[PDB]
Amino acid sequence: PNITNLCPFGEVFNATRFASVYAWNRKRISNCVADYSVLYNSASFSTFKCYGVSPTKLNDLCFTNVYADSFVIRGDEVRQIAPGQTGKIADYNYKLPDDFTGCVIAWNSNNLDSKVGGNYNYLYRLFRKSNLKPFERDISTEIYQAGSTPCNGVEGFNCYFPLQSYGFQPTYGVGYQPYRVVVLSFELLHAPATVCGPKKS
Amino acid sequence: STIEEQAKTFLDKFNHEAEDLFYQSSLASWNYNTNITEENVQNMNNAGDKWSAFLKEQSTLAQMYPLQEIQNLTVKLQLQALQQNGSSVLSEDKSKRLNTILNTMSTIYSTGKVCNPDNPQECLLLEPGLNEIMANSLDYNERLWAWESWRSEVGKQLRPLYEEYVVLKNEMARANHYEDYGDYWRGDYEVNGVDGYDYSRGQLIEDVEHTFEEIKPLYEHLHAYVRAKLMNAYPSYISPIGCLPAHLLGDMWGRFWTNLYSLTVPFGQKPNIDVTDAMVDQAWDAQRIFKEAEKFFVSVGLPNMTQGFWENSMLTDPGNVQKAVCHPTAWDLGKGDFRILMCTKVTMDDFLTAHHEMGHIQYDMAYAAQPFLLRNGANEGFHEAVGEIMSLSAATPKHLKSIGLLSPDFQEDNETEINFLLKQALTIVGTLPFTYMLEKWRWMVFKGEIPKDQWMKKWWEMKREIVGVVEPVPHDETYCDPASLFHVSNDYSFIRYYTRTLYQFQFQEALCQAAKHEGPLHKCDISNSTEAGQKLFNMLRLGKSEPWTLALENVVGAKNMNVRPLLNYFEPLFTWLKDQNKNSFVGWSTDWSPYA
Ligand SMILES: *[C@@H]1O[C@H](CO)[C@@H](O)[C@H](O)[C@H]1NC(C)=O
Ligand SMILES: *[C@@H]1O[C@H](CO)[C@@H](O)[C@H](O)[C@H]1NC(C)=O
Ligand SMILES: *[C@@H]1O[C@H](CO)[C@@H](O)[C@H](O)[C@H]1NC(C)=O
Ligand SMILES: *[C@@H]1O[C@H](CO)[C@@H](O)[C@H](O)[C@H]1NC(C)=O
Ligand SMILES: *[C@@H]1O[C@H](CO)[C@@H](O)[C@H](O)[C@H]1NC(C)=O
Ligand SMILES: *[C@@H]1O[C@H](CO)[C@@H](O)[C@H](O)[C@H]1NC(C)=O
Ligand SMILES: *[C@@H]1O[C@H](CO)[C@@H](O)[C@H](O)[C@H]1NC(C)=O
Numbered sequence: 001p002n003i004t005n006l007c008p009f010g011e012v013f014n015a016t017r018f019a020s021v022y023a024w025n026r027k028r029i030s031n032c033v034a035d036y037s038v039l040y041n042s043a044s045f046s047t048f049k050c051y052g053v054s055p056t057k058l059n060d061l062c063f064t065n066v067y068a069d070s071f072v073i074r075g076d077e078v079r080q081i082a083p084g085q086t087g088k089i090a091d092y093n094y095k096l097p098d099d100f101t102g103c104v105i106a107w108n109s110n111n112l113d114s115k116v117g118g119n120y121n122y123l124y125r126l127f128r129k130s131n132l133k134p135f136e137r138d139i140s141t142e143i144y145q146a147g148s149t150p151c152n153g154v155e156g157f158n159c160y161f162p163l164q165s166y167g168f169q170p171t172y173g174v175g176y177q178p179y180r181v182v183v184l185s186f187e188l189l190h191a192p193a194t195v196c197g198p199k200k201s
Numbered sequence: 202s203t204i205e206e207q208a209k210t211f212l213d214k215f216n217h218e219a220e221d222l223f224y225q226s227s228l229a230s231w232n233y234n235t236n237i238t239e240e241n242v243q244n245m246n247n248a249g250d251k252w253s254a255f256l257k258e259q260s261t262l263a264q265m266y267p268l269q270e271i272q273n274l275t276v277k278l279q280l281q282a283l284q285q286n287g288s289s290v291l292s293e294d295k296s297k298r299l300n301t302i303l304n305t306m307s308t309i310y311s312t313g314k315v316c317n318p319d320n321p322q323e324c325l326l327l328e329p330g331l332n333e334i335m336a337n338s339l340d341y342n343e344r345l346w347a348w349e350s351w352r353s354e355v356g357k358q359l360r361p362l363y364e365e366y367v368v369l370k371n372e373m374a375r376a377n378h379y380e381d382y383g384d385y386w387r388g389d390y391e392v393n394g395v396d397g398y399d400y401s402r403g404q405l406i407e408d409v410e411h412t413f414e415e416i417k418p419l420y421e422h423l424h425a426y427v428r429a430k431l432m433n434a435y436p437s438y439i440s441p442i443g444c445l446p447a448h449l450l451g452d453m454w455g456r457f458w459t460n461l462y463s464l465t466v467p468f469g470q471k472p473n474i475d476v477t478d479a480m481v482d483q484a485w486d487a488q489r490i491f492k493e494a495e496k497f498f499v500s501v502g503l504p505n506m507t508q509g510f511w512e513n514s515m516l517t518d519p520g521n522v523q524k525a526v527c528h529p530t531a532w533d534l535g536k537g538d539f540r541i542l543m544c545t546k547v548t549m550d551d552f553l554t555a556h557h558e559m560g561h562i563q564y565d566m567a568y569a570a571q572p573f574l575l576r577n578g579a580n581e582g583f584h585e586a587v588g589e590i591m592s593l594s595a596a597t598p599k600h601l602k603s604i605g606l607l608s609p610d611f612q613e614d615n616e617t618e619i620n621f622l623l624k625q626a627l628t629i630v631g632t633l634p635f636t637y638m639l640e641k642w643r644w645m646v647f648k649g650e651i652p653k654d655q656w657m658k659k660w661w662e663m664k665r666e667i668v669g670v671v672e673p674v675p676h677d678e679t680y681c682d683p684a685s686l687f688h689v690s691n692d693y694s695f696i697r698y699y700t701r702t703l704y705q706f707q708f709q710e711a712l713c714q715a716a717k718h719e720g721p722l723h724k725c726d727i728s729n730s731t732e733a734g735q736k737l738f739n740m741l742r743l744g745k746s747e748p749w750t751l752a753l754e755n756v757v758g759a760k761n762m763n764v765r766p767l768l769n770y771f772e773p774l775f776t777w778l779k780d781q782n783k784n785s786f787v788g789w790s791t792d793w794s795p796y797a
Contacts, residue, residue: 004471055327065699101746118225126214126217127213127215145209146206146207146210146211148202157262157265158207160210160214164214164217164218167221167224169536170225171228171281171509171512171513171538172337172509172537172538173507173509173536173537173538173539173569174507174508174537175537175569176536176537176538178566
């Protein structure tokens, strides 16, 4: 029949501000129609790497919920948003499971997220005692203890603040320019699947 | 937990915060250089002070991690680089005195203006005009006046300052567990902890003497030929048996002999390889010059320039309203930002300079993957050598014919090769005894081998013995003749040019053997060879992570600097000079036979 009530992809992709990678935004997408051909046929995306599913059959299959995680990382750190990777982002900021079904979409955002003075509103976690579990968010701002001595809440010697700012500038290299990353996670649960593709007439 | 993990986390924090502070400082320096305005000077000074204070605070924090409990070579290298006190070990009064002395020497050298007695209404500064007088005049007493007047004013101002400078730098170096300031400078080539590839500070002087002893026959023949030609130019001043007069070498100090090419040309009647007119006829813009250089670097397999390079570099003079430094400089600003600041003209020299600076940029791009404090050359010689090899390759007639700048029917006979090799010898071979003598004199001054009352008596004795250059009139100890040069007056190491010159031809032989060139070494071009680019990039990607001996093994297969590639490069010229010196006397006498 006639289809309306599209899924809110405008409020994820075209958001005025994105979250930091340590505090990545997760939006649960339910009970709407998800048109994936609009995203795939866009020329504005640099990375559209899908793991576990192909883009052609996205517009046909149906899923119970869609998780849209949005954050900003560097150009050289886009490769770490993948199953089985190692790095600062994978270990300490955003960890993907090995058995991940979904798509990683990234695009350059030097135009919006970089200012001439330096945009320090994007943070990343530099130190954590252990690696993150998949789909875990750590927003703690407690001082990292690298040494035997207690930090006592003050950043001195062997005790560092774990969140460090990115300093985006428009004159940076392509490996240091800000990239907005949206990761879509597709899961099927025993509940009735409601995020279905558009049906042709 | 462990000391090594603590040092690794500290190095991660240092790398991340240092890279951003270094970017801000470098961008301020760039904004000053492309726009000379007082607010840009203030911003540069503020950024530099923040950067220096941050380095002091991080070095102070870094020393608290002992070196002997760390086993990873890269972590130990970064900690060794960071834990150097520098001037911080010295007292605050003496540190302030040393900084004041360095600044006032910089002002005296930069703003030194000297003109002829009895005509003082206007005067000429060295950089604007004395260079042209030294490089183009053919008058004996005029060059003598310029040379003696500049060494009189500059040396008489700088002699007490240099006497304070040597004592303060020796005090800082012995406070830093070095024998002298010369040992501190030689510590750049020090490799410790690697089995077989260890290099000592004391081995550098021995290697320099061993290489120079093999340099000496070629320089003696070149000196005899230059002496005969200068005798033709100036009939009575130059003796057949003696040294060359100091003020006749084509430059202010004798650093290069490249301004004597007109006087000492073998075959003037034969044409030159000047390609300036060909670019003028085809309307080659500076953008086209850099695109051709980029085409050269992509032909060998190296990465091409970034979009930010083309957008952010200044490759043309901005105009009258905006002031900029004219000196060509490649800037590695950090964070993948690479720029070239050159006031490019349509000349061969600017085209070769474009190749040289883009070689600097390629070297900077290659070690971008390395940690911040290891983003340098393995030694001070490699960074200049990798630009000089591109300057060597681009200047070849094969490269000019390949890119269309030279006519395909240009006749490459032996005479043009001889005069081109002589020009390259005047630029390259002639600087080697001056560089070696200057560094050996500074090392003996820092070591205390030469007392302060005997500095000049030894110095001229060294110059006659090594360089074969005699003083026009004797100088007493009120003069300070070495410090009239830019590098010595402003606290710069000078052995980098000697090491650069040997590394240049070693790299050239390695890449030409890789590229399967079948002729003379000076006729070799490294374009179109992927394997040569791969052999270069293996060393280029390392940066300062590996010892310079291991990097040299990676390129040439040798663990030490070698002199045989340079001698192989100039072998046609060496045979020609031996043929031309049959009647004349090779070698010089240290006596006062020409003039004193
Ligand atoms: C986001 O912005 C682009 C650029 O204006 C636009 O073409 C696109 O339709 C917008 N929405 C989505 C869902 O991509
Ligand atoms: C150079 O500085 C002047 C001084 O204010 C400024 O007006 C001009 O915009 C600067 N040039 C550039 C290219 O920004
Ligand atoms: C040294 O540390 C670096 C990380 O900075 C690591 O990648 C490298 O493998 C280490 N080397 C050794 C021999 O452990
Ligand atoms: C730097 O100076 C301090 C102050 O004396 C000293 O304890 C330290 O050992 C010095 N560092 C090195 C590497 O010598
Ligand atoms: C550099 O080379 C790559 C791959 O050949 C190419 O995609 C890119 O456009 C080149 N860069 C420029 C500025 O031409
Ligand atoms: C160049 O080659 C010719 C032919 O053998 C020879 O006569 C001449 O002397 C050579 N000139 C030089 C400078 O080697
Ligand atoms: C190197 O390759 C380019 C591209 O094909 C070619 O134009 C050039 O002539 C080659 N160089 C030589 C020396 O043949």
